[PDB]
Amino acid sequence: MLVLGLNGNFSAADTDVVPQLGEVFFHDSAASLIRDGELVAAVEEERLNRIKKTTKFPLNAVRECLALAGARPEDVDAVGYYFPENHIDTVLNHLYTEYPRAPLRYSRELIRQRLKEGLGWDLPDEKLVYVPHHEAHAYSSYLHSGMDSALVLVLDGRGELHSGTVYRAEGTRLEKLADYPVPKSLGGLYLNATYLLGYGFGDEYKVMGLAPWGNPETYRDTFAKLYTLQDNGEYELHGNIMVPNLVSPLFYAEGFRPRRKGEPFTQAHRDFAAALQETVEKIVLHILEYWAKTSGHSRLCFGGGVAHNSSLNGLILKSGLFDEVFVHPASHDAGAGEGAAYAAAASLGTLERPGKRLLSASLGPALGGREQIRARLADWAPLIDVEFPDDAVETAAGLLAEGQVLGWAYGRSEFGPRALGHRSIVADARPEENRTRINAMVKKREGFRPFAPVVTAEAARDYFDLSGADGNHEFMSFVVPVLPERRTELGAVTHVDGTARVQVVSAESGERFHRLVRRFGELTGTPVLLNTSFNNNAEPIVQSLDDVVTSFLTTDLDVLVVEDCLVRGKASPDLGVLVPRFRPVTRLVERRTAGPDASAGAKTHEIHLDYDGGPSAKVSPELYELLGAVDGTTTLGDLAKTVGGLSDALATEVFALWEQRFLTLAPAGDIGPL
Amino acid sequence: MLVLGLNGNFSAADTDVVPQLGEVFFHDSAASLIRDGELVAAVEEERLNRIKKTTKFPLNAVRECLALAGARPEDVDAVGYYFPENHIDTVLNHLYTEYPRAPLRYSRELIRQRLKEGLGWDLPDEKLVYVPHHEAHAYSSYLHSGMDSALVLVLDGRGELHSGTVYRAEGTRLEKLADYPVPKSLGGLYLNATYLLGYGFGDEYKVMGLAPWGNPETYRDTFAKLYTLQDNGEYELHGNIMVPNLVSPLFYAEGFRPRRKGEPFTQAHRDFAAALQETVEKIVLHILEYWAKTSGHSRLCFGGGVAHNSSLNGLILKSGLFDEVFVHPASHDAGAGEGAAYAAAASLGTLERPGKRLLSASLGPALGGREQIRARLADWAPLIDVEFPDDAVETAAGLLAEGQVLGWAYGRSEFGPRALGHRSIVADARPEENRTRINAMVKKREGFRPFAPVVTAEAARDYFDLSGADGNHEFMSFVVPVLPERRTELGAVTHVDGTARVQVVSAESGERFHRLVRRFGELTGTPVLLNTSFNNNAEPIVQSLDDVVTSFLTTDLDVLVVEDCLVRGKASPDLGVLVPRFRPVTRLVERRTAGPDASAGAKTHEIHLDYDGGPSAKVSPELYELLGAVDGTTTLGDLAKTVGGLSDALATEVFALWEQRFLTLAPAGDIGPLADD
């Protein structure tokens, strides 16, 4: 039994199903492969097309999952999709009425067209199974919990008809106990409030990271007008007929002005986040306190996108409601695509389930074999020096104790948004300056942002207060208090409220990462490391070896440890050996506007990425002429000859387009099949 | 007492408040001027920036209105805005949360800045009065009716809180009787249904025009699921949590598939439109039966964008519920902007009302004086031939009897969507072939589109059944039956169901136009002319002389009559003398896309208009080099020398771009400041 789980929209690589398709229309595209009830491969398409939270069809992710399982398309028994057929088709139909040129191609045709053109796979209609959205979520959260009975809560933005569902799980059987309608969505509320702080979709864990810095008293009574806790676990949210945002009209009325991009976060902003975070905690625990005593379950699985609110999770944990809580590492819509596979298996036959709680998220493609990795790093020789230590883990621990900030790339990439020892950036967790520098120089992000610690399983309770229910901490699902007497020791990973979004690494969850953290503690007295995700501000988590090296050279990391190799940047790196290649979304424009006296304005030159929310950048006339000559095989040095050679000015300008990922710069060739 | 009325959004000429601002966010921008209670001036901004139903701030319209009234900006005593301040500023706030780089400027700051930068007018804060949206509509519709009391129904898409409002009007007082919430919008219902026919915002009247071609029984039981008539004049519309459209999910579930661009209208399309039109009539008649009995009133003023549904208006007329029915020529938001002026006068002091019923929509800027018109037509000499007849009306009447289609441009331009004898295209109404002749070869639009007749006040009742009630027919607000014994005589202007959207021109509403139609009737025994708007598919109704000449040269009209001058197109017109100018929204672009093997794709060159829903067109490398050198003074022929000269190929390509209005092509200079009459 081999079943493919699918989620996302149906856009090709270079175009969208309608032009400029909005970024929220079936996002977080991914493919999951389960076989005999075990989850053998999972990767979000964002890692492969390099578009964060992409909507495009997860074609590459399917191909990558088939390869990791050693399977051909013909070997797959069923395909699940994380929404009912009528719902996705009605939304497609709506997009079509707004874009009268788009052909009427609905989801069944589009899935079968993508799989046939992109993999040579004629999917039979009988094998494609559509699935209720929260049923998919619930399966994913619950079957990977290691529990035989539980209460499953699914809260997200919305499914086909509900914003929240409560399930009873026993064995492999789900039983609905409750749902909440779409206009009560807590993910809708949280996204709605997020737009008031200059953020947009995807930024909601920044708002959650800002809330501890604020006082939830200021706007407590303002938010109180937007919801009412009712009896027997019910609640109402209170809408308006002004704008499609639940939060802005009332806060506008009260003098609150939405933050602009590039403006500092004022104390009024910090208090807003705090009040928002408190509201959602109040409602969810209201729901949970009720359904805990009503259904009788002492164990909770929490899924849906809202279950990535680690702060909420840490408060469910510290409440007394449950003895055991489980959260999947992908609880957002990519997790729901995995669930669709389990739900498809159950509709055609019986449902095989995992036999242990999921401990590792390391489920994507790997970097390659020892020899193709060494061969590909040779192709980067004009930019990097490489060492091969006897014990890279031992060497990396020493470098970490010397104050070096490392990139750490090993094995298969992490499914879900957190890095857990396979595509990580790590540093000493003790100096509070490391939070300031890694925020401002490395990840190039907002100073208020916290940093998550990884601690060994054996020293966890020496540092963090895990009391209350037993939660799973392998995937950074829970915010926990740092023990008061350790807060100054762990200055980089302790937040303003004394909490941390902790990962507890064990030999069974990540053997090599546990080795790194244990050996660091033997050298320093502190088996705790700072562990942020290995990506700059312009990209999702790095996937391939070329991704890892590109990101290392274009961020300000000290050393890269990739599959036992020690990589450092060359003194004077030679950008001219690198082969420029357009991304399928890369676009070059020469534009003239109206000018003074109804004239043609002066020319400008822009590179941009052709998707909703995609960035853009001005380029010189010289580089505009250079990038126009890109053929995918000629190096940047030989291309630059047609504008008179690769001057230092041009290489710097290219280096900045590279850092914003406007196009691919990598040595000739590629690593080859893994 | 001099009051400015404003409506629309606050975008500049060359950008929008937020980028690519949606075409629905405060549309049909217009300025209006009332002095001592009379509407002295009013033009929609679309006429001046040439963007149909534009949302941009109506700064030009304001300047035109001040000049037609001989007023300094500092002479204005109050400015009125057609929405309340919390509402527009809350919508702006929402646009600002979705575009976090947009400066936080709300409506009061934005109105003042457009008037200080654009006119030098430091607007005092105490002069700006914001007005409830259906209150503005109501004033416009009732103060021009000539009625001393009436029931007022305002039914549009949306105001701050309502989608329909019912008033009692006595003298100058409005008294609210009822309302319907936003989710019951019939305007919204109609626009939702328009999207399923491959059309969009601004095409509703096309959908109304298609409805007679179809049988409302096919989808009658399907629409019945979307609404319910209730007691006490209430109705419910039945939503869904699937998509922001009331109609599409149910029809998708029953196999209805929305029309694509360029597809022919199938019988199911025609039936859908018919069933859609039958529903809105049924509901609006259900509202009105109740409020005509309950208020007991015999006079009705109907306002809001839904009141441009002339089919609905005629059915209301043929119902025996009212004795009189009045409809303002601009019942869409441009009229709320006028009404906003009155409501500001009522708020700030006393409300002066119009003496008589409004008879003529001819409230815009005028073409110009006799001398400067002759001078400007001289600049156009390389492309046109011009005669100066002794009686142009008499010359025109014979031409029309001869079978020519005529451009007709006189005086001040018509407020509202209808052309009524000041910016019109006119032809013999008798031959049925003249429909496809003027549709397919002149307007260049769908052929099903029927054509409106203009009849004389004297002959009117000899051709149309104006019975049922006394409706005002000076603005084509009412569709009426054509008398069966005349339906064959009037072949170009009789729809498939026997009806017509009649203008009735009198010596009082439009003298010159009335003489024209009367004379043609003396020459033919049929005092009916076909009357359509003077504009091709890519522009609103023309405004300036250069607009009128441009439009004549880029359509296939036989003759143009413009202020007593007869203009025809030269055998070979000389495009080289026209001076190209960029419009503020013109963008010229060289584009490269991703190619195979991760390469750079092909350089495509294109011109486009940078506003939501604006057109675009591919251009040759040679025209791209030429257009990029446009300096706004040098002629096309002199610019063309930098690429080898204006070859016939380039002139054709430029001409096709001219025809789609991508840029302004016009002789050097302008007609100059429009002089005083």
Ligand SMILES: COc1cc2cc(c1Cl)NC(=O)C[C@H](O)/C(C)=C/[C@H](C)[C@@H](O[C@](N)(O)OP(=O)(O)OC[C@H]1O[C@@H](n3cnc4c(N)ncnc43)[C@H](O)[C@@H]1O)CC(=O)[C@H](OC)/C=C/C=C(\C)C2
């Ligand atoms: C113009 O036309 C329409 C317009 C609209 C609706 C429609 C139409 Cl047609 N009509 C339809 O039907 C939509 C259809 O159905 C659809 C696209 C459904 C997709 C699959 C659904 O995706 C899901 N299932 O919500 O994915 P999930 O990954 O689990 O979670 C994600 C949620 O969780 C929260 N969240 C994450 N992180 C934290 C944290 N750390 N703390 C607290 N909250 C957090 C997030 O904040 C977010 O709210 C997308 C969705 O919800 C949208 O906002 C993301 C609301 C979108 C609503 C609109 C655009 C108005």
Ligand SMILES: COc1cc2cc(c1Cl)NC(=O)C[C@H](O)/C(C)=C/[C@H](C)[C@@H](O)CC(=O)[C@H](OC)/C=C/C=C(\C)C2
């Ligand atoms: C994304 O943000 C949105 C989207 C919608 C609504 C609102 C908002 Cl903020 N909220 C309002 O309040 C709208 C406001 O009042 C407005 C533009 C009023 C003009 C003058 C009316 O004409 C609106 C209509 O009637 C329009 O049909 C032409 C249907 C529009 C529905 C929409 C534009 C859906």
Ligand SMILES: NC(=O)OP(=O)(O)OC[C@H]1O[C@@H](n2cnc3c(N)ncnc32)[C@H](O)[C@@H]1O
């Ligand atoms: N704020 C606001 O809405 O302005 P507004 O007074 O100009 O009305 C526009 C509305 O009238 C509806 N509408 C326009 N023409 C229509 C027609 N011929 N039939 C029905 N509805 C129509 C249109 O589809 C849209 O819902």
Ligand SMILES: [Fe+3]
């Ligand atoms: Fe979800």
Ligand SMILES: [Fe+3]
């Ligand atoms: Fe309106």
